[model samples]
Target chain A: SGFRKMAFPSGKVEGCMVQVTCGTTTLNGLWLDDVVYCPRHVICTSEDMLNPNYEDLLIRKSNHNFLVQAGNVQLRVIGHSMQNCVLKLKVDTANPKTPKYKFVRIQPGQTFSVLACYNGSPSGVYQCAMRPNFTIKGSFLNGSCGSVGFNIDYDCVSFCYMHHMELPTGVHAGTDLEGNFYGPFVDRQTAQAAGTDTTITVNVLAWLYAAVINGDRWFLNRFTTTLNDFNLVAMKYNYEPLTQDHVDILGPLSAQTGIAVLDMCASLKELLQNGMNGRTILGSALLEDEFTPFDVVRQCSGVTFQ
Target chain B: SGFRKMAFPSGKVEGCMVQVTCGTTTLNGLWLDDVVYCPRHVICTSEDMLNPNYEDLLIRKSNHNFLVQAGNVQLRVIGHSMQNCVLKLKVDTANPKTPKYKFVRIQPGQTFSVLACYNGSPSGVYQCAMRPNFTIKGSFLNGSCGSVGFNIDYDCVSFCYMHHMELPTGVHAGTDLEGNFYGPFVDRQTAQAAGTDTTITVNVLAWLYAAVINGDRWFLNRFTTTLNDFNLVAMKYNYEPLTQDHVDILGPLSAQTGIAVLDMCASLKELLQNGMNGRTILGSALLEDEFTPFDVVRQCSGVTFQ
Candidate 1:
């Protein structure tokens, strides 16, 4: 526990306190104004533990960056000498091929929070590198962060809660292109029990893949919307909201070839918590199939495109 | 019986026999040495009964041009032709729109053995004509032979053998694109019993038509391969091979918006025995998607093509 500790006469520190740190060749002023102290508490004092300049990025036991809570998950980052640092977390274990990447950037001294809901621990690592900023703060250097994890179940009851409502009209509960029903078991329990059947599994996977690839607007809208509802559910469970990312990584995985159900569930669990992110994916998916005048003529009849 | 009766030594002589008949003006030589003869056989002979040259294409009791066996089905050419004669046969009772045509050239004296297979006596008449040859045997005229019948049942058991093997892996025993089990019932018995359930038949036919129209390589390959396998099956049943025609009539039936289950089954039964003919209809189906590729790249990568 390397957190900076301070005490006041009233046992509750309010205003602000300044700590001075001197290294082998450098001196800096650290701000303790944002730190909260309760009565009889003795907070540790150290610049590295609280706000390491450009060296140690690890969070001390009581550092605000440690175990920052969001909806059903908690996210944290350990990095140094970073300004406007954006952490891109890819839910890899859930979907190795077309994993969903969530972008959450932290301001100068604050730890960024993430919105996510799952049945098991979330699986993924962060890529601290930011895209070329050609305009605002565009000339930022690349950086690195250590560890991040969200403790939650991958197949949690809440994930199914939203999907169950959207399944019938959304993905048609895995109805295929030819209108053959492949699934829609009473609930997740029934589906898990029947997963051993390869015939059932293959068909189910195919429908999911088709949706991830070529789903219509109505389908995607419901997909992302349901995801949003899931996030709201997580929030009610004590999860909190953090800051949004400048880069738009929230787009449907339409261009991807395959989408495993495990990944599909995991991706949406985190994606739905941020309504804007869900819309981003939806917009991205739709942009891939923007309308043409020819469609109009073809659908209108008679008029033709030259 | 108006078949020409020729006599040779040994009563039932069987050697690579060759007979030559000459006539004036055309200087044509007729070859009847390959004709089979029984003991004490009194074969009838006449022009219209044996070899009516370019006229009188009557199907007499002893007409050598009638009931030629390819496999289990009989193919008859009730016509008199000079060179490159085309006989179009519409298994009228089978499919009125897409007719199977047999091309046979009676070069001076050679009587080609036509190949064909059907359930009962094939239901069809012939419209015999010639494409412009313009030289030694060009400038041919048009003609036809009426009242063609083979006295066989149109719904014979022999037609099911080829389809039986292909019905499984080839057509996937009618499991359908969605992999929902629909048919491949024990035998024709179970098939017929379930067939009364139009639900099964309609779905099966819908997938079949889609495959016939838009199936991928796997599906199309399986389809055509099964068709080839079926034709080989027919050849083993005493069916002879017919000549391929130069006409583009081998295309699919594109304008027929929809196809019923009965016609689909009947068309396939006859088509599988004739691979090239099967593609004619497949080609017609492809015409329905001639405008799809343009819609593809545009649909690809989420960008509308202009």
Candidate 2:
């Protein structure tokens, strides 16, 4: 088989060998969250007269880059920690190439699972699939190799999003100015798909895009950077409270502007609830100032950013 | 009586009033992400009511402090935003003095429902319950109020957790040194109860408590602080490369030590993956060092801190 089941010897490599004691039964699989075993080691769709037992263990939690190859196709799936992990889970498949580069964002109680199977023959071909919904199907040969499969189930609370300026204490990423974007980015789908979170990405962006473009500045990752970035820009527009920035961020920053608004906004009302400082956030009063924020959005809705 | 659904009038009340668009329906039941509502004119459940109509409303994204109150008992349900939400979602209906308390780390797809009912008269007390097991019994008084009930089905992704330390990016809290504590705190049960998430808080702390006590210093919020806090602590211990700290962190830092370790560790191996920088991480090579990190754990097996 192109892939070996028990790749690690008793003398396992650094990041390779992983053993978990399910009660007293210590099994050798990959990663530490949970162990992977094919209760009934099947060689084919039929029974087990086939190649080897650990047929699908091709891609365990890899060392350098998490990946493996079979025949013409190669697979690399990143993000495997399982504990409050940032499912920066990138699953790539190609004879060696939208959604061939899959970016998986895990919500609560979800796992990034995969099954790698190969016949005992060495055609260098392997087939793999993820669990829950194994969107990426593997390529396994029928004629020669026989039947052998290995499975890996990786778990996590949610996927961490980078790029969003600060980490959101509420989301587990970072907790500062940048999080405004990150929270919504990861939440957009999860909140909608499983109601696991709320996304203010669109709301926040609606205001942000309007402000940055209106003020003729560049869009940024964190709330502060956008302001701090082109100091001249803030000044150019002579924006201090960045009345526009405040409305840009506040309109969606503090409350539920649709489910698009997130829970972090609650903290905005509470003040520095989870963040290091309130440098990034607009302010509590802004959310309190009744009509101002909404008025900004009213004006904001129609004006498109060129 | 005390609280009302649709707390927001067609006229609003700043942050207290949040909106969630339910299709074209435009849900007026406050924000599930943590909006308080009492829409019904009846007002029995106070904020929540007793109709199957809203059996699953009243729940939204959240963290450590999620509480709802009615009559003598104020129900405080912690852990929403299933982002690393604890499966230990439990309720302790103590006395009416200090509102019942519930700690819940959710698995996505579950909603937090509540209802309140009462009879004609005008006694403040009423009956109430939260669904999904309908675990929280109410303090309904049949002798008074009106024969009316209001039901609430607050919606959202999950409850949020705060004060555990840092926010957990993977779980919707702070994403720093603190989460080392939060994820494990929440997952300790969820991962076990529902096969959701992994818990590695114990392992990391074993090394942490061991190191901090040995190094004669304080523990931490972010990894750096554990280090930065008492400069004298590090120098006094003369702990270089904090070999012990590395092993302390690395022991559970890199991969699976058990379900205790989390998915974030995968990023620990990936280089500043989600965090702003790699300050807290022990480093990738340490995990690649084969026996070094583990050997320290072996030596650290015992030696408790008094």
Candidate 3:
């Protein structure tokens, strides 16, 4: 049986005694399995196998590779702690010939599993390696060799976000003035006036989707709009009284014009519910309304940029 | 330092190895470390240190008897294979002995998790060990080792059930005629007519609990003279019509009741569209009516069995 045999680097080594960390002992079979050449042993004659560092095991020089002449074959790195070792290999052998050495990563104090992938090539050499250079060397100290059969494949995903802006809590519905929208409520009148606030302004928050902006601007021009103090209070107390009345009038009119009355009613009910949370005050109406702040002077505010 | 260790069934042999099939290889360290006097180098006599298959290495002699020492212990073969490979031990050697060797039934491929235990004597090892026999051997040769670690604690409820049934699927339920309840659903069903081909009576395939006989003896005996055949079809078929009448009734009533009549009117109006494909056949009509044969039929037809 003519099995393929790869030296330290695909039968292309300057020195016959190809230097190897003890951890790379396992790729001996993977190379044989990949290429047709088989060898009794592909010795990794480096003194570094006793150093249990994963990175040291990963450093593959250009002249580092394996050969295979296969029948049934086995590859392993024998040592005390060659677990959680990783091996990697590169095929191209030019001036900057990608390092053909394979690297493997293994777990300690437990039995490690093997993972393999075979891409067919009539004449080819594969590199198998191990990780945690310290572990590979330690194993050599413990009289053992590591192998490529213990490869574990794990996968994951990645994503990115560009600009993010957050706002400090406040009352009042305001607009960004630049065709951008904001809440109608800002702060309590007493707090704004006396600095030691009385009642905070009531406001509702709403989201403006990305589709709402024209491809320009990173900052959310306007997200959600909130209702202000008195308007919010009255709206809650009235329960969409005006809007509902308007719907009632338009509902009959729409029906006469062959427009869907039921659809209009549905639209009306939704608008009423989402419009406001109408609130009310205690008795003594008239005088209180016309007094002190003249219904507590109110106005729509503009969004202030930070 | 004193990690609990003991020689049970009265001193068979020191360093007598018993292959532990299940449970964590590291947990053996509890006894191997502080209790048994086996040196690490002595334990390293063999390179197969990870998860070892005890059955392939040793044998069990007595039905419920085994010897356990820290460093190197193997099994005594009286006969056959240990089902769960659970070892039952009784430590009567030294004083301050607490019969703490609890017999846990761990299967070959099951992971043994943490044991939350308390209140056991110091060294009086009286814990029982037993493995539950499993017929399931994995398809792969050297797969993941399941029986390892103190990560799992067994439960009595789970243990007792397996001890009796041996099957993973659960048992059935039933009831006693005198009112003791055993509630469960039927498993299978079959139908046959006795003597006369024209006669028919459906049998309820209730679950077998305590069992029952002569069930008809316990019934109300008398009821209203006639069974009611309510015109539920007409009622449901005309839901939009009924809803129209409901709008008339609720509109005025809700207004009188301080509810917005407009909302009720809106709900009624929306029903006109959805009720176009509405279905409201009564359960009884679904079971017995000939004018409307059901599209589907199963044995436990019209009974809730409550």
List-wise, what DockQ does each model earn? Answer: 0.01, 0.01, 0.01
Go through the candidates in order and give each one's C-alpha lDDT.
Answer: 0.20, 0.23, 0.19
* Model 1 Cα lDDT, one tens digit per residue, B104-132: 22211111110011111111111111101
- Winning model by TM-score: 2
Candidate 3: which docking quality band?
incorrect
Those runs of model 1 whose alpha carbons end farther than 4 Å from true positions after fitting are A1-181, A185-306, B1-71, B80-85, B88-306
Question: What lDDT score goes with residue B261 in model 2?
Answer: 23
Best by lDDT: 2
Model 3 chain B poorest ten-residue lDDT run: B201-210
Of models 2 and 3, which has the larger lDDT?
Answer: 2
Evaluated on chain A only, model 2 obtains a TM-score of: 0.17
Q: What's the TM-score of each model vs. the native?
A: 0.13, 0.19, 0.14
Return the DockQ of model 3. 0.01
Ranking by lDDT: 2, 1, 3
Rank order by TM-score, top first?
Answer: 2, 3, 1
After superposition, the stretches of candidate 2 with alpha carbons farther than 4 Å from their true spots are A1-306, B1-44, B47-306
Tell me the tens digit of each residue's lDDT in model 3 across A1-306: 000000111111100011123224422222311221111122333344223333343344232344221222222222111112212222232122122333322221111211111111111111121111111101011111111222111111010000001112121111111111122222112232112121111110000111011121122222222223223543553422223333353343344334333332333233334431221111110101111110111100100000
